[PDB]
Amino acid sequence: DDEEETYRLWKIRKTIMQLCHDRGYLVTQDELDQTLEEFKAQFGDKPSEGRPRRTDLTVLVAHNDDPTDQMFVFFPEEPKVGIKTIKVYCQRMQEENITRALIVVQQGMTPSAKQSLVDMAPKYILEQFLQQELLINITEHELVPEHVVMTKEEVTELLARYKLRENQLPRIQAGDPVARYFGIKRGQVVKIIRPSETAGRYITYRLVQ
DNA sequence: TAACCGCCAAGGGGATTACTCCCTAGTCTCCAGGCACGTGTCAGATATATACATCGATAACGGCCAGTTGTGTTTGGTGTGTTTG
Numbered sequence A: 001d002d003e004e005e006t007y008r009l010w011k012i013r014k015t016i017m018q019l020c021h022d023r024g025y026l027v028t029q030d031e032l033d034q035t036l037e038e039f040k041a042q043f044g045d046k047p048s049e050g051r052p053r054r055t056d057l058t059v060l061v062a063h064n065d066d067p068t069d070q071m072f073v074f075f076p077e078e079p080k081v082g083i084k085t086i087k088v089y090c091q092r093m094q095e096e097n098i099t100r101a102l103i104v105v106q107q108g109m110t111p112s113a114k115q116s117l118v119d120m121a122p123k124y125i126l127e128q129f130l131q132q133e134l135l136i137n138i139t140e141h142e143l144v145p146e147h148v149v150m151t152k153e154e155v156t157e158l159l160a161r162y163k164l165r166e167n168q169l170p171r172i173q174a175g176d177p178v179a180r181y182f183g184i185k186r187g188q189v190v191k192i193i194r195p196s197e198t199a200g201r202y203i204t205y206r207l208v209q
Numbered sequence B: 001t002a003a004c005c006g007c008c009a010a011g012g013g014g015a016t017t018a019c020t021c022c023c024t025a026g027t028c029t030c031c032a033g034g035c036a037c038g039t040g041t042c043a044g045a046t047a048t049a050t051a052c053a054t055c056g057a058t059a060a061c062g063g064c065c066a067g068t069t070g071t072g073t074t075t076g077g078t079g080t081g082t083t084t085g
Helices: A003-023 A037-043 A083-094 A111-119 A152-161 A177-182
Strands: A070-074 A100-105 A125-130 A146-149 A189-196 A200-208
Touching: A003 A037, A003 A100, A003 A177, A070 A083, A083 A100, A083 A111, A083 A125, A111 A125, A146 A177, A177 A189
Parallel strands: A070 A100, A100 A125
Antiparallel strands: A146 A189, A189 A200
């Protein structure tokens, strides 16, 4: 389809922009909530072998406080992305000092690809998202409360306040969709704020592991 | 003084005889005694037989050891599939 594909692309882009904004990267208040009309008028609304073709709508955004830190958002055309594509992406990334990135794959990448992805991990952080997982922004959902990634200093402050070993805090595996959304990694604590029906508000913490 | 011798006397009684009674030695027969067998009995010795006793063998009895409906999960391998080298 044409119209549906354009709608899907616009939704994916909006989701990614909201995600980057949540993480901390600075983004236009315009593109954060741009409707679909300007999207059509910008790209062409002819994804079917036309102007709005993938890999052309990628967006690079720099962090809020560290203008030196950016992250790509690729959109490979291969339904079953291989390793060669990620290989060339990483090579082309290597020219700049960028370290983080985000891959949007049509369909699930082959298992051989995940091995390569993790292999380059310490040097170039890159993670994957299925468009099917990006068509909706979970963090807005009624059930999913509000997360706040904590800085190391305050994590130490918390642990020293409650005299509690970080091993004793609750756990949240990295695979969790909220974790992958925020880009948290192992050994890092996420603050959770829930409306408590018996206490108004209740704040808890979860160490990723 | 009486043993002995002599003359004298009566008659006892010893020997003989004819004759008779009836005794007794002898014979055939057959009893009393005595010493030998014959049958029977009691007592004893030798022998066969039944019974209780010691000892030996089989072996019955005591006793041991032997064999004789359903729901809800996990893991782990095979076949197909895709990508990689």
